[PDB]
Amino acid sequence: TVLPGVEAIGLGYNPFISYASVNSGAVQLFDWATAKKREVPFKAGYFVPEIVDVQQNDSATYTNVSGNTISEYQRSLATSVAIEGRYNFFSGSLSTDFDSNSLRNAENEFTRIQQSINLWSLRLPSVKSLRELMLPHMRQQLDELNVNDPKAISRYFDRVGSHFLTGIVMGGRAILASSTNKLRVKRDYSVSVVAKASYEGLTGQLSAEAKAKYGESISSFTQYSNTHQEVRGGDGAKAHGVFSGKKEDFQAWVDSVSASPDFVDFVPTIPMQEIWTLCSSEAQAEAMRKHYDDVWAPAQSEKYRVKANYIDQLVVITGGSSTIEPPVGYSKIEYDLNAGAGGDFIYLCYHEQTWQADRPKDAVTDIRIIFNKEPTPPGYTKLPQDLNKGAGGDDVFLCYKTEAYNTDTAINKVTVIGGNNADINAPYGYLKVPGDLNRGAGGNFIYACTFVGK
Amino acid sequence: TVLPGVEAIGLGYNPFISYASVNSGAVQLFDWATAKKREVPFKAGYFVPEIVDVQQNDSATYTNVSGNTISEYQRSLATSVAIEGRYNFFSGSLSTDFDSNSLRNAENEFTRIQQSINLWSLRLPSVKSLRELMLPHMRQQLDELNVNDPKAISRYFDRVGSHFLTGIVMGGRAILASSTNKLRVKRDYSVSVVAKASYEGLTGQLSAEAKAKYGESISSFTQYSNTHQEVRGGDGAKAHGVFSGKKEDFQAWVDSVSASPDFVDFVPTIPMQEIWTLCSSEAQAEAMRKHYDDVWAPAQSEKYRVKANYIDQLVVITGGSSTIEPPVGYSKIEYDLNAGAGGDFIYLCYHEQTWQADRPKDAVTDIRIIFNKEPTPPGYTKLPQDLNKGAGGDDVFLCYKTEAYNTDTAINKVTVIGGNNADINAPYGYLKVPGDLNRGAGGNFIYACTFVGK
Amino acid sequence: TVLPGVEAIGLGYNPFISYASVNSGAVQLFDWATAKKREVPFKAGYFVPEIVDVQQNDSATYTNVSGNTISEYQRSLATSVAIEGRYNFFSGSLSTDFDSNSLRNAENEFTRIQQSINLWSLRLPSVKSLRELMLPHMRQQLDELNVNDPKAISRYFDRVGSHFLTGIVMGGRAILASSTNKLRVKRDYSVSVVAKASYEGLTGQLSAEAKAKYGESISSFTQYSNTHQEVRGGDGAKAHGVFSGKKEDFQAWVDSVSASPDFVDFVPTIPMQEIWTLCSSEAQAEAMRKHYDDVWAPAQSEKYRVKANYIDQLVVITGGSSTIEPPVGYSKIEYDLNAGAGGDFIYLCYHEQTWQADRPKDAVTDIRIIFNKEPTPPGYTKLPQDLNKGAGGDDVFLCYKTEAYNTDTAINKVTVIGGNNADINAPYGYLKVPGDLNRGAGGNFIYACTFVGK
Ligand SMILES: [Mg+2]
Ligand SMILES: [Mg+2]
Ligand SMILES: [Mg+2]
């Protein structure tokens, strides 16, 4: 009887596809049916190939990743494992942890809370005899790889993986992933704290005193965030009970992870080894390593870089009540451009465009206010509504310029801010336009603020 | 005893016919009865051919695909699998996920929510010895393929498939597919969020707090969308219970998927391999690969491109009450062209034509308003009803031009918008015609808006 | 023990006779008693000939076909299977899905809702060794076919079929076929939506919320349509329970399909192969293929083309009450030709003739109104009743021309439309005649509208 996980160690792995999942590896490079076995010291009746070192490490454990923005989350994710380079490792998990719009939505900040239920971990040393344990066809394929063609190496890394697993933890994990509107959730605590506290709440691990302390903070987090939930290892008939809010259901799953563990986490010291560790020629290793970091890992990292949504069109709507509503394609900035100035209610509305590789639109890239009679600046559009309509004052018109999309300049968000002071502060990172949308009218000073993510 | 799924790995597959279904593959290329077996480490008493690598990966998992338009959904679907080129892969599933009119209806946006219930996954390496495992008649047929005739290669890809499966996940899946009127569903959340939340509601996975938060949003989604439901793997006598709204029925199905799993999903890293990987001559592979992407995959992708419905005829109806009703062939734009102007109620009505390959009609391609006495512009039709009938003012007449169908110019939708401002905003992507359908009359300004999908 | 369905794969098949039914195939071309067997991996204790590939695909599935007109339904039916050419494949099913008058009735639109209960599917590869498995007399008959006589080939395709089955799905199916009066059913949803929803209602699959949403729409669909119902596979003593409105009865049938499945659907990728794939001489294949598409498939497709009913005679009836009634041979257009004009009630009545191949009558092909004293136009008939009898005004008479039947010009329907506006709109695709049937009288303007299906 082989120890569970011997099938999963040595598996050829693609870092970018996913984190700590076997779906990220393509086929097993090493032959362990033929190899000499060793009995597992702590689990008599189970055997492993003598090359692997298996340590018991029974320990329920946390791995938490967070970032105020996706490009930050992608780096705190990538650095969660001892691995070389700045590449967006594990970043393929984004496509399944988070809703695709919510990755593109620049108002979100992201947290992933993973409770690993460790049981044991299998380790594989970097000794030169590893080559002798490869399956013959795998060794033959690697030995005949035509490293004189970049496409062959690139296909090899794609088809076989760039690394192979050398550190495995076998157990269970429950994960909660969440994206949270960072403009509107309560800031009393860091979102990782209320993320973890709400994860503990959903699993019932949150104590009576913590439940009171976090309990008011987690409701704000709960309503303003999209919590994806998943669970792995253990009895799938009990896996759905872990988020049942009841400790007996969570423990009933934990009591099943021991029977049927899965690959859930890496061993921090030696998670995986590069595939050219196994090739017999140093000149082959040089070509493969050179291709890996000169070409393949750059392209793979770039192909997992996520754009933000951007504004492509603005409109203004006017009417006699607070509840007037934009054309269906647009969404409304809820601050009245005549707030306190009387007259008509006026609202600024925008369209945010999803970026597309083959047909990016223009973004909006600049906005200006031109007032009474000044001509529209060269190449700007102008909205025909007077932004003091009914309010009196001077005639106010807003103009904006559109240009082909560039991440350096496509405006991601806009807002309107107003108050009694002329020197009013925009939200952090926003730039406000000069000129008052109630110039000459009564009421508040009002300014349009613009935000670019870069 | 062979492990379930050994019959399904190596199956020759057509990407375009469907996603993650065995109905998309035509016959098994590899002979695994003769081949040397290996016992499955985690399932003693089951065996596999020694070539395949089987990993346990017991993990309930989500794959979600969405798009504001079908051409977007077709690309988010195609990119849901690591596969080469921009072709409309898996796009044959459209014919069974969605109602055919609803694919043609440009007011719809599309979401597919799939919960895969994974159990294990079978992997097959790209080693050169695969050729030795092919069935002799399959190898003989591939070896004698007359690649000097494009029709022979095209028939081979059609009859045998262009790829073969190298990554298989065996388990269950429940799918909800929905098309939703994007003009009228609530925009509080992205439709993928309320799609997933309503899927969780139908399966009972939605929590008490999420049920409150989403519960008001999902009813709007529910009434304004056509949710197709299907389920695969597990006991077919319990499969219909999964959408019973009750967790005990859903779990009772999950508890049966473990006994009788099906091919439900791909392994993301190595889903399928090109068929010319197996041909012995590189000159044959060049001809097959060249034909695949120069001819066959283009034609197959194009033959899955979906037109939108288009307007081919307009009429106006007039009468003494709000509830007057068009001729049966037409449908009514519910905004009165004398709203606030008194007189007769007037409504604009249209026919939307289904596109046909052998007999496309004319579409409407331009609309104009000509008012009192100006002659009808060259080649335009004119509607005889005065669009201020009973309202006084100037005599208003609407004219439109029709031309043979072209996706670049066939108008897909029209609407009438009106309000107190002359500078009123059309819905996003609509173009409004110049001139007021109440010119000289009282009441609102009213304009006809036109939309082309391209 | 042979797997159920081995008798049905390889069966020589006629596409035109029916869809997915064994009654459409004439005798089995291949000998599988002698052939070497293979045990079915997923059903130990059942065997198949080693040539066939059997995949389990347990999946309850939908195939839906719809069209606003029969010639559209015939094409959406024909294209429901991957098969070559524009021929009216499967069109023989019309004679049993729909009432013959209702195919001829141009007011109907057609929907077929099929729920396939798949269990497994048998596949047969296009390998050259198929010829070796043919039964000797079948091979001898094909080898001696005198392809120098078109009648011999035509008789062979008629007697033996033009194709043979290569893809089989074994299971059950329940079908609802319906023809619906497209002029009078509610247009809130597409008829395929309320067809499917009412099918789900009859089988009990419609949910509580869908039952409310569709429930008012399905009653209109139900009363205005003729739903044929049939069921196939499973226990015939439980088959009639599937439309019992009760899920327990439907599931009780599904639980019996697993014991006694039938041929219910095709495998989409490889449904059937042309019969000249099996002939040994390419010169024979050329003659057979040339005959198939030059002669036989055209004639078979044409012999399944359905005419519409047409108007052959018109009469007018006059009297003192709304409820006056035509001569028994005619049916009445319910709009009074003196509506609002007082006097006598006047109604226009018509006879619609069934087309006959050996004795087509004249159709009506033109209609005119000649008023007071103008002579009857050359070759027109005239109705003697004044269409302002009792109403005063000018004397109104309707004239019509009859000509030998032609689908290009035989008028299929007529109607009378009236209202306060002179510029009133006819129903879509109708043409209204000039002149008012109340000219000089009071009341509404009234016009005769004519419709030709072509
Ligand atoms: Mg203002
Ligand atoms: Mg008007
Ligand atoms: Mg009259």
In the 3-class helix/strand/coil scheme, how is chain A assigned residue by residue? Answer: CECCCCCCCCEEECCCCCCCCHHHEEEECECCCCCCEEEECCEEEEEEECCCEEEEEEEEEEEEEEECCHHHHHHHHHCCCCCCCCCCCCHHHHHHHCCHHHHHCCCEEEEEEEEEEEEEEEECCCCCCHHHHECHHHHHHHHCCCCCCHHHHHHHHHHHCCEEECEEEEEEEEEEEEEEECCCCCCCCCHHHHHHHHHHHHHCCCCHHHHHHHHHHHHHHHHCEEEEEEEECCCHHHHHHHHCCCHHHHHHHHHHHCCCCEEEECCCCCCEEEHHHCCCCHHHHHHHHHHHHHHHHHHHHHCCCCCCCEEEEEEEEEECCCCCCCCCCCEECCCCCCCCCCCCEEEEEEEEECCCCCCCCEEEEEEEECCCCCCCCCCCEECCCCCCCCCCCCCCCEEEEEEECCCCCCCCEEEEEEECCCCCCCCCCCEECCCCCCCCCCCCEEEEEEECCC
Residue A284 phi, psi (nearest 5): -70, -45
Residues A66, A112 contacting (CB under 8 angstroms): yes
DSSP B14-32: -TTT-SS-GGGEEEE-B--
Residues B162, B274 contacting (CB under 8 angstroms): yes
Residues after which chain B is discontinuous, using a C–N cutoff of 2.5 Å: none
Nearest-5° Cα angle at A421, A416 to A425: 50
Q: Which ligand is nearest to the CA of B439?
A: 2
CA distance C200 to B226: 13
Residue A250 phi, psi (nearest 5): -60, -50
Distance between A22 CA and the closest CA of chain B, angstroms: 7
Residue numbers in A near B60 (CB within 8 A):
230-231, 236, 239-240
CA of A351 to the centre of ligand 1 (A): 21
Partner-chain contact B141 C124, CB within 8 Å = no
As a dihedral over the C-alpha atoms of residue A69, residue A75, residue A78, residue A84, rounded to 10 degrees, the angle is: 170
Angle at which helix B208-223 crosses helix B191-203, to 10 degrees, equals 110
Residue C301 phi, psi (nearest 5): -65, -40
Q: What separation, in Å, do the N-terminal and C-terminal C-alpha atoms of chain B show?
A: 55
At B88, the amino acid letter reads: N
CA distance A122 to A32: 14
Residues after which chain C is discontinuous, using a C–N cutoff of 2.5 Å: none
Partner-chain contact B213 A223, CB within 8 Å = yes
Place of tokens 């200006």: A368
Which residues, at least 6 apart from C356, have a Cβ–Cβ distance to it below 8 Å?
A: none
Residues A115, A12 contacting (CB under 8 angstroms): no
CA of B340 to the centre of ligand 2 (A): 9
CA distance C241 to B334: 44
Which residues, at least 6 apart from B86, have a Cβ–Cβ distance to it below 8 Å?
A: A358, B75, B78, B301
Which 3-state string (H, E, C) describes B233-285? CCCHHHHHHHHCCCHHHHHHHHHHHCCCCEEEECCCCCCEEEHHHCCCCHHHH
Residue C23 host element (H or E):
none
Judge whether A438 is annotated as a binding position: yes
Q: What is the count of residue pairs from B and C with beta carbons less than 8 Å apart?
A: 144
Residues C426, B327 contacting (CB under 8 angstroms): yes
CA of A337 to the centre of ligand 3 (A): 62
Chain A neighbours, 3+ Cβ pairs < 8 A:
B
Closest CA to A314 of A369, A355, A358, A360: A369
User: Which DSSP symbol is given to C22?
Assistant: G
Q: Please list the residues that pair with B403 across neighbouring strands.
A: B363
CA of B114 to the centre of ligand 1 (A): 49
Which 3-state string (H, E, C) describes C165-213? ECEEEEEEEEEEEEEEECCCCCCCCCHHHHHHHHHHHHHCCCCHHHHHH
Residue among B57, B192, B427 minimizing CB distance to A262: B57
Tokens at residue A397, please?
A: 């018109």
Tokens at residue A450, please?
A: 């613009």
The pairing of strands C331-332 and C362-369 is unpaired
Which 3-state string (H, E, C) describes B122-146? EECCCCCCHHHHECHHHHHHHHCCC
User: What number of other Cβ atoms are within 10 A of residue B212's Cβ?
Assistant: 11
- HSE at residue C78, side-chain half, CA atoms within 13 A, is 18
CA C178, C179, C184, C186 torsion: positive or negative? Answer: positive
Residue numbers in A near B453 (CB within 8 A):
none
Cα A51 to chain centroid distance, Å, stands at: 37
CA distance B61 to A319: 48
DSSP C320-371: SSTT----TT-EE--S-TTTTT-SSEEEEEEEEEPP-SS---EEEEEEEE-T
Cα C113 to chain centroid distance, Å, stands at: 12
Residue B297 host element (H or E):
helix B297-302
Residue among A159, A231, A240 minimizing CB distance to B126: A159
Closest CA to B200 of B235, B181, B227, B238: B227
With CA atoms as reference, the chain A residue closest to B38 would be A33
Distance between B330 CA and the closest CA of chain C, angstroms: 7
Choose, out of B425, B430, B432, the residue to mutate when testing the contact with A (most A CBs < 10 Å): B425
Binding residues of C for Mg(2+): 337-338, 387-388, 437-438
Nearest-5° Cα angle at B431, B426 to B436: 70
Strand ranges (DSSP E) for B266-397?
A: 272-274, 310-319, 331-332, 345-353, 362-369, 381-382
Q: Please list the residues that pair with C381 across neighbouring strands.
A: C400
Q: Please list the residues that pair with A319 across neighbouring strands.
A: A345
CA distance C151 to B438: 71
3+ Cβ–Cβ pairs closer than 8 Å linking A and C? no
| Total residue count of chain C as it appears in this document | 454
Q: Please list the residues that pair with A25 across neighbouring strands.
A: A13
Distances (CA, A) of B185 to A227, B6, B63, B114, B227: 22, 45, 23, 22, 14
Q: Please list the residues that pair with A263 across neighbouring strands.
A: A170
With CA atoms as reference, the chain A residue closest to B190 would be A101
CA distance A416 to B193: 28
Q: What is the resolution of this structure in A?
A: 3.1
CA distance B109 to C331: 45
CA distance C59 to B231: 7
With CA atoms as reference, the chain A residue closest to B167 would be A26
CA distance C290 to C287: 5
Classify B398 as helix, strand or coil: strand
